[PDB]
Design an enzyme around this catalytic site. Sequence first.
Site, short mmCIF file in Angstrom:
data_model
loop_
_atom_site.label_atom_id
_atom_site.label_comp_id
_atom_site.label_asym_id
_atom_site.label_seq_id
_atom_site.Cartn_x
_atom_site.Cartn_y
_atom_site.Cartn_z
N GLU A 61 0.82 -1.22 0.00
CA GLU A 61 0.00 0.00 0.00
C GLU A 61 0.85 1.27 0.00
O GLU A 61 0.37 2.35 -0.38
CB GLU A 61 -0.88 0.01 1.24
CG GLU A 61 -1.88 -1.12 1.33
CD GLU A 61 -3.02 -1.01 0.33
OE1 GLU A 61 -3.12 -0.01 -0.40
OE2 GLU A 61 -3.84 -1.95 0.28
N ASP A 74 -6.00 6.36 -5.28
CA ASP A 74 -5.38 5.07 -5.54
C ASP A 74 -5.55 4.67 -7.00
O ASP A 74 -6.08 5.43 -7.82
CB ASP A 74 -5.88 3.99 -4.58
CG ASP A 74 -7.30 3.53 -4.87
OD1 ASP A 74 -7.89 3.98 -5.88
OD2 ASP A 74 -7.82 2.72 -4.09
N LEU A 94 -8.62 3.67 2.54
CA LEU A 94 -9.58 4.23 1.61
C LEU A 94 -10.53 5.13 2.40
O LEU A 94 -11.15 4.70 3.38
CB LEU A 94 -10.37 3.08 0.96
CG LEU A 94 -11.38 3.46 -0.12
CD1 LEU A 94 -10.70 4.10 -1.30
CD2 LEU A 94 -12.16 2.22 -0.55
N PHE A 110 -8.26 -6.74 3.68
CA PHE A 110 -7.94 -5.33 3.87
C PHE A 110 -8.16 -4.57 2.56
O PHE A 110 -8.74 -3.46 2.56
CB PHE A 110 -6.50 -5.24 4.36
CG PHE A 110 -6.00 -3.85 4.62
CD1 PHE A 110 -5.65 -3.03 3.55
CD2 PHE A 110 -5.74 -3.41 5.90
CE1 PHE A 110 -5.15 -1.77 3.76
CE2 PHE A 110 -5.21 -2.14 6.12
CZ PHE A 110 -4.91 -1.33 5.05
N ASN A 129 -6.37 -18.52 -10.46
CA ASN A 129 -7.71 -17.96 -10.38
C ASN A 129 -7.75 -16.56 -9.81
O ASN A 129 -8.52 -15.70 -10.26
CB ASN A 129 -8.67 -18.92 -9.67
CG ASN A 129 -9.13 -20.01 -10.62
OD1 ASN A 129 -10.10 -19.83 -11.36
ND2 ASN A 129 -8.37 -21.10 -10.70
#
Length: 175
Positions: A22, A31, A43, A115, A143
């Site tokens: 981050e 972001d 956020l 998170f 995946n």
Amino acid sequence: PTTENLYFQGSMNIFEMLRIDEGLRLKIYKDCEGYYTIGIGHLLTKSPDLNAAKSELDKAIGRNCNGVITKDEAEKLFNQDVDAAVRGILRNAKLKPVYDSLDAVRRCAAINHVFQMGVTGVAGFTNVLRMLQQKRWDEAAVNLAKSRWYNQCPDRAKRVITTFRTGTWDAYKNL
Ligand SMILES: OCCn1cccn1
């Protein structure tokens, strides 16, 4: 591995992992998805209105920040967000069994994923969760690499995916 190399896993934990994925920013920024963010991946809001972001910031920190915080405030908010992710997994009937089945390093990847995406987003990866519970690590990683989460913002997700594949901290070495 050298003596120093064997010490590396003792230096890594969920806080250091998310701090790398981050970054650390003391001013409001957008972001990779265009959302107002601050600190270590906090956020603020999905609203396009910077005033909304600033209002949420002041609420979160408890003072008139005018879009700027200190490193100590960033860290406190980060610890709060990490605790929220962990609590979100443990109370969820779908995520808890998967988390419990994982080793320590993959548990960090799980907290990191929550998170980043939130509980319902992660709980929606039905196939990946089954793959992880069944220790099908390569399939799980392939995946995850199909997801919008990864593909829209690869640099923030790539390390997490590798960590699900290997259960080691290697993706966090040699920055
Ligand atoms: O991130 C996928 C693995 N996970 C399991 C519980 C929470 N996350």
